[PDB]
């Protein structure tokens, strides 16, 4: 354990891709099924950088209300977060403000990356030009596709750089 481990909380509406994203980073395969998460499932995720090694403990929370578990409670001691939404579902996006509001209530000013998932789907319903989230210094946005592998690493790279205060970080 020569390097620290940052607590990353993964949040967002049900079926947005949270679990599929994390899973693809961990095994490489893309799950076609949607098996709601119950409470949370913490998964360790490590990346090798040009400066050293960065370790993450991704807290994959549950988007469905009925399976929320300890939502507020998983946020405690987070060094950062990722709020996810479906680009093919206007409702998952209109809800981003509520997820953000609660992360802030527990941790303030931690870096947060907002991802628009499933941009690989031909009929997008939330155009990237509409995103106004990243207008904050500790906030950022990205079009991602857990399926097409598009901008797969971006969120983790941004966060990693913000966390280690070193814009020079690059994954190896």
């Amino acid at each position: 354990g020569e390097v620290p481990t940052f607590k990353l909380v993964l949040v967002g509406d049900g079926g947005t891709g949270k679990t599929t994203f994390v899973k693809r980073h961990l095994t490489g395969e893309f799950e076609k099924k949607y098996i709601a998460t119950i409470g949370v499932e913490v998964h360790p995720l490590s990346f090798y950088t040009n400066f050293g090694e960065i370790k993450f403990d991704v807290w994959d929370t549950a988007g469905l209300e009925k399976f929320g578990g300890l939502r507020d409670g998983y946020y405690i001691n987070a060094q950062c977060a990722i709020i996810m939404f479906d680009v093919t579902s206007r409702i998952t996006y209109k809800n981003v403000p509520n997820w953000h509001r609660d992360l802030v209530r527990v941790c303030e000013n931690i870096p947060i990356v907002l991802c628009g998932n499933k941009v690989d789907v031909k009929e997008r319903k939330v155009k990237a030009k509409t995103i106004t989230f990243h207008r904050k210094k500790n906030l950022q946005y990205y079009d991602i596709s857990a399926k097409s592998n598009y901008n797969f690493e971006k969120p983790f790279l941004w966060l990693a750089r913000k966390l280690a205060g070193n814009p020079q970080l690059e994954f190896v």
Partner: peptide
């Protein structure tokens, strides 16, 4: 720091 343990506790 044990992950298996964190998950167990949260449940």
């Amino acid at each position: 720091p044990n992950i298996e343990n964190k998950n167990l506790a949260q449940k």
